[PDB]
Amino acid sequence: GHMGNAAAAKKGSEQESVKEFLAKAKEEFLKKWESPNTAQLDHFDRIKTLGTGSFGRVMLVKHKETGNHYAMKILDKQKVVKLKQIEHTLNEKRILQAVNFPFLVKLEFSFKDNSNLYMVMEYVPGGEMFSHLRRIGRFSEPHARFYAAQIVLTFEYLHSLDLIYRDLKPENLLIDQQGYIQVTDFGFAKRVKGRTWTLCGTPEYLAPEIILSKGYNKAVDWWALGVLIYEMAAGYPPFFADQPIQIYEKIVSGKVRFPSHFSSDLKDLLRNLLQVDLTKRFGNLKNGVNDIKNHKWFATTDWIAIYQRKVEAPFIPKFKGPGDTSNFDDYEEEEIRVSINEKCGKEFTEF
């Protein structure tokens, strides 16, 4: 076979240890999930905007009492107007409260006022994977593999808790001071026991079954991992067009082309992730995540060493001191206005 006796038994024992870990992780998650206003706005100095989207923004803030720095996500309650926009915000807070994994950003406080919802997380100063990737062009395959392995482990953890992530992309992956990944932005994450139906995510990363309005499951995250690995190694994603409608047409076609510099092992992995047929997609078969972890392209990956953060990272961002923002792009700064009247109070009772 491909493995000898010593290797096969080591692998089996490793796989049983993963099961033992995930059983304990699920017990710890459920305790926090069943048992979810830990600060207020004037406890923080607002320093700089780190990113902006349609419903709000993330700012670097400094805690006045401790001097610690954090990333604060601010959501305008009125702008969170659409039905799925509201439910998704409650998902995000509750999931972040309850999870614990070395590559998942840690929530510290959440609170709300008359105008806004707030989530205060750990500040990750090395910047988005997105801007390092665009600056250098593409990552070599060992570099891309080091990040991919962290996503595989993070999805194995989330999916074992029945959580789907649903917004993987380089814009949502921050690089910490040791060069490891921190997944942020759980705005699209959801606990799903079987199928779910919301049409959501980012066009280039959508699985075909989402675009086709089919009920779908956690296998959409494994498709998105194929898109991410392709983009990291190529410098552009596999389904690439100026307008979302054109992107959707390419995704549903079933027709990926690869740069001539991709290794054959990489192409084989990507064909099995970017698989339209759900009866054939890696991550979705009887052997689950192990079809990915045991693929030839990951043969050099020490999965436990990645989890334990024992592996030397390919790139360490430069950091000048606490509250350094040099690894982030600049954004227009807008005043944070809090109305004298409560907005949308009944809609956000649970937050």
Binding site: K84, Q85, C200, T202, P203, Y236, D242, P244
Partner: peptide, 14 residues
């Protein structure tokens, strides 16, 4: 060919 090179916004519905 041509495609989106800047940051990509997610879509909550549709």
């Amino acid at each position: 060919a041509a495609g989106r090179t800047g940051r990509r916004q997610a879509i909550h519905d549709i």
